[PDB]
Amino acid sequence: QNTVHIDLSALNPELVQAVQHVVIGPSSLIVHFNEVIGRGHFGCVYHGTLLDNDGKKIHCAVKSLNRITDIGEVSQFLTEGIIMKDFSHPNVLSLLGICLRSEGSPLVVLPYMKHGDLRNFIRNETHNPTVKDLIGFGLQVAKGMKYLASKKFVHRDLAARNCMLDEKFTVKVADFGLARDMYDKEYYSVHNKTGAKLPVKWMALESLQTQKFTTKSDVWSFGVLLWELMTRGAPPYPDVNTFDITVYLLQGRRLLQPEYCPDPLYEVMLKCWHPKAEMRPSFSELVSRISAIFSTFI
Ligand SMILES: CCN1Cc2c(ccc(F)c2C#N)O[C@@H](C)CNC(=O)c2c(N)nn3ccc1nc23
């Protein structure tokens, strides 16, 4: 549609062609602004009712971006997150499209997750996840990161709070690309010189020192995610406040083994926490080490 040139006239030409491939007509989307499912730094996430080509009314989550005041920053956000339109994996949150509107902000359309984020699903005292069920979640997250890493994409915010569960209990890595924001305002430290939002208790040791993220720092973060699942959503490093983490990790200290974490899986965690990033296993090694531990549960 030609609405891109008008409603997003601050976009680089090549990005105009990119976002044009994923535009949703306003007649296809019903945004339930009175049914807010959550908030965030960049804006709110509402309920949605998308209508596909055949006519299926699909439940979706619509992310508002009205809090980004600078209209040039909106173009940068779409510039950094448009690549996600090329991602199609069962364990990675797909992108349904973008609804554009001048005198307003572009609406990002994501599919709805019935059981919310993975952390609040396993912390909830009403659900009963067996040890095997929790390792199944970790295996799916490793499958999603194996795909993302294969696309040379760095997540730099991988945590149980950023993974989701659909109706069939399929885990989907999220909080990346156009769906990236800050939804838990207690775990992130804002850099006063660069503005980057850092999950310090999830970043690799080398990431805390130089502020860079590779495909090995998400392996470290994936280690926290496996620790969270075993502890059913306990806060990592509870006795170490955010200024001693870096010194805590330089001595070689790591997270203790959870009371119900099988020894082979903890071994996978320490591998993710190698001080040398090049010694950590790839997400393809993780998808074979964890799947083997998950298959012993027959
Ligand atoms: C924009 C996409 N987001 C936002 C979102 C969150 C929380 C954690 C996340 F990694 C993401 C992401 N990416 O929002 C939080 C305020 C709460 N989000 C939800 O309860 C939610 C749901 N039940 N389905 N569903 C689908 C998508 C979706 N959020 C949800």
Side-chain angles (χ1 to χ4, degrees), residues 3-13 15-16 18-38 40-51 55 58-69 72 74-79 81-85 87-99 102 104 106-184 186-192 194-211 213-238 240-275 277-297:
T3 53
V4 164
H5 291 123
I6 322 179
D7 304 331
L8 304 168
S9 91
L11 253 62
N12 181 298
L15 210 82
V16 155
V19 306
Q20 268 189 328
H21 277 101
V22 78
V23 167
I24 303 185
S27 52
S28 305
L29 191 63
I30 282 179
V31 198
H32 319 265
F33 291 109
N34 43 347
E35 270 145 29
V36 194
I37 75 181
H41 192 61
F42 300 155
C44 272
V45 193
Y46 308 102
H47 269 311
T49 307
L50 189 55
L51 276 66
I58 293 312
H59 204 166
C60 56
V62 178
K63 171 63 178 186
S64 172
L65 304 196
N66 62 28
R67 287 312 275 263
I68 304 106
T69 41
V74 185
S75 94
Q76 215 270 41
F77 188 73
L78 299 156
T79 308
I82 193 54
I83 175 64
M84 79 175 305
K85 66 145 181 148
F87 295 173
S88 200
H89 195 274
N91 300 120
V92 172
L93 201 89
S94 78
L95 173 85
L96 271 285
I98 307 174
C99 194
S102 92
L107 295 162
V108 196
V109 191
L110 288 312
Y112 178 67
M113 301 308 244
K114 194 216 209 75
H115 301 282
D117 75 302
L118 170 71
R119 175 161 179 255
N120 266 318
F121 176 82
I122 62 171
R123 288 178 48 104
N124 180 264
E125 292 85 317
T126 300
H127 310 157
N128 308 121
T130 60
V131 183
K132 179 211 200 156
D133 278 344
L134 298 161
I135 302 185
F137 297 144
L139 173 59
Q140 295 185 45
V141 177
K143 278 160 162 186
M145 301 305 302
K146 174 191 184 165
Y147 175 83
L148 254 51
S150 66
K151 293 316 182 74
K152 295 304 182 204
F153 185 90
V154 188
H155 201 277
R156 77 221 198 107
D157 197 12
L158 183 60
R161 70 178 169 272
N162 296 335
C163 296
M164 288 267 179
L165 267 301
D166 66 353
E167 60 289 318
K168 306 192 224 69
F169 294 102
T170 296
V171 194
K172 256 147 181 159
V173 185
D175 204 317
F176 79 101
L178 296 178
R180 171 147 300 214
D181 199 1
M182 218 194 80
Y183 307 94
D184 199 315
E186 97 168 80
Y187 298 105
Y188 293 96
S189 168
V190 187
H191 204 277
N192 51 341
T194 75
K197 287 152 232 186
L198 315 187
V200 282
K201 298 208 194 86
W202 282 258
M203 287 154 56
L205 173 78
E206 84 274 350
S207 205
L208 293 153
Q209 307 183 276
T210 64
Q211 204 182 155
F213 306 91
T214 59
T215 177
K216 290 315 200 196
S217 56
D218 292 331
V219 168
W220 182 293
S221 300
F222 178 73
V224 184
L225 183 131
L226 280 181
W227 186 91
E228 288 165 272
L229 295 159
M230 294 298 100
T231 68
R232 280 197 65 181
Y237 310 94
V240 206
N241 73 319
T242 72
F243 307 102
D244 293 311
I245 271 290
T246 312
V247 198
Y248 181 94
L249 297 174
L250 273 182
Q251 320 184 243
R253 298 214 222 282
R254 295 297 187 265
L255 281 184
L256 298 163
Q257 173 163 0
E259 189 191 313
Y260 298 96
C261 176
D263 286 46
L265 194 76
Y266 190 56
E267 281 265 289
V268 168
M269 259 165 256
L270 290 336
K271 278 207 186 311
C272 301
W273 303 332
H274 207 281
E278 58 280 358
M279 306 305 267
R280 298 164 205 180
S282 67
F283 283 116
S284 192
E285 268 208 1
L286 287 141
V287 86
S288 60
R289 295 184 182 275
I290 303 172
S291 67
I293 301 168
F294 170 76
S295 293
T296 64
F297 294 110

